[PDB]
Symmetry: C3
Subunit: 209 residues, 3 copies
């Protein structure tokens, strides 16, 4: 049964996420009608029962399209530098594999910043960091860390351009509007819904003491 | 429940399409067994209830493989040139967002020509025009308009080659066999099932007055 | 209903495969929780009822991730070198198409070697041969044959690197550990779970008469 009533509406990550090893920021949402499942299944292979695994961390004011996925569990027990990539350690039904060593290796957390737009069916590899403000094109295969405000696409994903000038990006990284009190975001809404980064920064300087 | 009985058979677009904002030509079909849904769900985010949206237009004698998708609704309410890509205007459950502006922007219709082969899990971005005779490889991410008779593939999709010489393409674009009366298509079937473009054009000149 | 109980466990190919035109080696498995179906549906368009079609052959000690697919049935009745790519021969419901010729062309078997790791949602095109020891990255679109021990990724897929030196690859191709009696694999398990290719080859020379 589809978790979603409509392709024209998602649901807050904070409302649907049940895996303890996913941490999500305010207002971020997943719109998953075309793939049926809620967001937890987007975090593939993420054990929910222990601290000693790579975690998935998502910032605030993120938009995540249908069927995006975040590949967890590191190398999933496969070490291609070993003679075989086959996970003998994980097939203990076979007594002949009893002397196997565990190939599992962590990749580090997957960290998605604030104000990140993730297109439908993008797939983020293990251990990837995505900076604030990035745009991940639909169907991107994200194999490398993504700089703040980068627009990327492709398989493998490559940076196409940045959303703003370096000077504007510096202003945004300084003001961190995604952490403002809600009443300031409410007041700033006309500027947030605009290309006027300099004006948004001017408001930040006005209210921030 | 799967809309399709078999992976070895599709169904005519004209028989399955119910969205009023999808227009389809004769004999074009969708073979969707491996993704379950009928063709309407291939047109993602396509509002069915109004005239003032981008429409999906598909020509005649097109073949569409399983899970191909056509991304509609323009930018879906996200403007990356604005300070935030987050669609505040669409989260009016939050009163703090009441002053938001609508970021929505149309992309233009998605237009698929005649005699177009679309491979399984190709994904066509908003506003894309695909010329007559094109071949869209499986898993293509189509980010730019496609020339008539181009064979393309990849993510992002790139033109690999064309199906015919420029001279042969000129003959095909002149004769427009996909608009012939059915009795002419019936008579031309041996030539249509052949590489004899010059002969097909000769038949067109014979019957077209 | 999901064929799989868990994303953390697959099932042996030998246990789940029912299509007579799929041949699989020992211990190879498919972990398909995120796409629901058992492995047979991974082999798209593979007729089960006759000898005169391209077959899917998979070696031993292969690991196949969720939603990987192997596109069978050659050109599926579409010949882009003909005037139309539309499969008139397959729409005999329309009497006007009765003079159509069958465009179907075989591509040759799809052959996956031993000790091959196939990432989730990789898609292998018709007729492709993948050498022993290869690693197929997640979401690869595999359009060309893959050399033994190549690590590939992308759409279209490209070779990134090889797993071992040419000298080490030569040792592995000579010893063919994937065909050893199980008692030798059991004894060699510490070396198989290691980067010590030279030591594994030394054990092979010790026991092989
Ligand atoms: O969920 C939301 N938007 C997503 C797009 O990110 C939703 O799927 C959607 C798509 C299209 C659209 N439209 O055509 O205006 C509106 C919402 C907002 Cl309601 Cl928060
Ligand atoms: O036991 C579990 N996971 C273990 C680590 O505790 C690991 O992922 C695993 C998977 C399969 C397996 N096996 O085939 O027996 C053993 C451990 C469950 Cl919590 Cl998924
Ligand atoms: O994913 C893409 N486009 C989507 C289609 O749903 C749409 O055009 C879009 C692109 C960017 C965006 N953003 O920068 O926030 C929002 C929607 C391309 Cl960037 Cl690959
Ligand atoms: O406009 C500004 N301040 C005015 C008073 O000069 C007021 O405080 C204000 C701030 C923000 C705003 N907004 O984000 O829409 C509107 C008015 C600064 Cl951005 Cl210069
Ligand atoms: O639907 C049709 N063909 C699609 C391929 O575009 C169908 O999925 C199919 C696939 C393979 C095939 N074969 O092996 O001959 C026949 C039909 C025709 Cl019946 Cl109109
Ligand atoms: O009301 C609808 N769509 C509106 C435009 O009329 C637009 O897509 C939309 C989506 C979500 C929304 N919201 O969160 O309240 C508001 C409008 C339904 Cl027809 Cl999908
Ligand atoms: O999609 C592709 N191949 C499909 C696999 O189902 C098949 O080989 C095919 C290719 C082209 C085609 N056509 O030009 O009409 C028909 C089938 C490659 Cl072109 Cl990426
Ligand atoms: O073959 C041709 N005309 C013959 C008579 O000369 C006849 O009219 C015809 C036309 C088309 C055809 N076909 O498409 O198979 C067969 C015969 C022209 Cl293509 Cl030169
Ligand atoms: O099926 C198996 N492994 C696959 C990975 O190839 C399974 O999906 C899996 C994934 C992650 C994992 N982990 O976190 O350790 C264990 C098994 C082994 Cl149990 Cl044979
Ligand atoms: O009859 C079958 N397949 C035939 C070859 O025997 C071929 O794939 C096919 C598909 C569709 C079709 N049709 O539309 O009538 C005819 C043959 C079934 Cl076994 Cl799938
Ligand atoms: O598919 C990939 N990574 C997977 C994510 O599940 C994982 O990092 C992995 C990569 C290689 C591998 N191997 O060489 O056997 C095993 C797991 C990249 Cl190689 Cl594209
Ligand atoms: O270690 C070796 N032989 C020892 C005796 O010298 C013994 O036969 C053995 C072989 C393999 C092995 N293993 O794969 O772990 C352990 C001991 C050869 Cl690899 Cl040099």
């Amino acid at each position: 049964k589809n978790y979603f009533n409509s392709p024209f509406k998602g649901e807050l990550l904070s409302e649907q996420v049940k895996n303890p090893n996913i941490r999500v920021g305010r207002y971020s949402y997943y719109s998953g009608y075309y793939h049926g499942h809620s967001f937890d299944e987007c975090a593939r292979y993420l054990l929910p029962d222990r601290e000693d695994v790579d975690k998935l961390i998502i910032g605030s004011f993120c938009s995540i399209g249908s069927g995006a996925s975040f590949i967890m569990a590191g190398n999933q027990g496969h070490q291609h530098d070993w003679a075989s990539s086959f996970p003998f350690f994980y097939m203990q039904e076979e007594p002949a594999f009893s002397r196997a060593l565990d190939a599992f290796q962590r990749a580090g957390d997957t960290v998605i910043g604030n104000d990140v737009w993730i297109g439908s069916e993008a797939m983020i590899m293990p251990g990837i960091k995505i900076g604030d403000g990035a745009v991940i094109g639909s169907r991107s295969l994200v194999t490398k860390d993504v700089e703040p405000y980068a627009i990327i696409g492709g398989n493998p994903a490559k940076q196409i351009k940045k959303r703003f000038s370096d000077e504007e990006i510096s202003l945004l990284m300084e003001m961190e509007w995604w952490n403002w009190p809600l009443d300031k975001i409410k007041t700033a809404m006309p500027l947030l819904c605009s290309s006027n980064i300099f004006g948004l920064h001017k408001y930040w300087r006005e209210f921030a003491v």
